[model samples]
Target: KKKPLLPLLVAGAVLLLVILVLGVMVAKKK
Candidate 1:
C-alpha cells in the first residue's frame, strides 16, 4: 500500500510534463 502509490504518482507527473510540452509545440506551430 505504501510503495505502490509512489510509482503511479511519478508516472502521472511525467505524463503531465509531456502533455504540456506537446501543447506548447502545437501553439508555436500556429
Candidate 2:
C-alpha cells in the first residue's frame, strides 16, 4: 500500500515536470 504508492508519486511528479517544461518550450516558440 504505502510502499508502492511512494515511488509512484515521485515518478508522477517527475513526469509532470517534464511535461510542463515541454509545454513552456512550445509556448516560447510561438
Q: Where is model 2 poorest over a 10-residue stretch in terms of lDDT?
A: 1-10
Residue-level lDDT tens digits of model 2 in 1-30: 446687898888998898877898889998
For model 2, the superposed segments whose C-alpha errors exceed 4 Å read 1-3, 28-30
Error of 2 at 27 (Å): 3.8
Model 1 / residue 12 / CA error / Å = 0.3
RMSD (CA, Å), candidate 1 to true, equals 2.8
RMSD of candidate 2 to true structure, Å: 2.6
Alpha carbon deviation, residue 2, candidate 1 (Å)? 10
Error of 2 at 20 (Å): 3.4
Q: In model 1, what lDDT does residue 5 have?
A: 81
Q: Give, for candidate 1, the lowest lDDT window spanning 10 residues.
A: 1-10
lDDT (Cα atoms) of all candidates against the true structure: 0.84, 0.84
Q: Which stretches of candidate 1 lie over 4 Å from their true place?
A: 1-3, 27-30
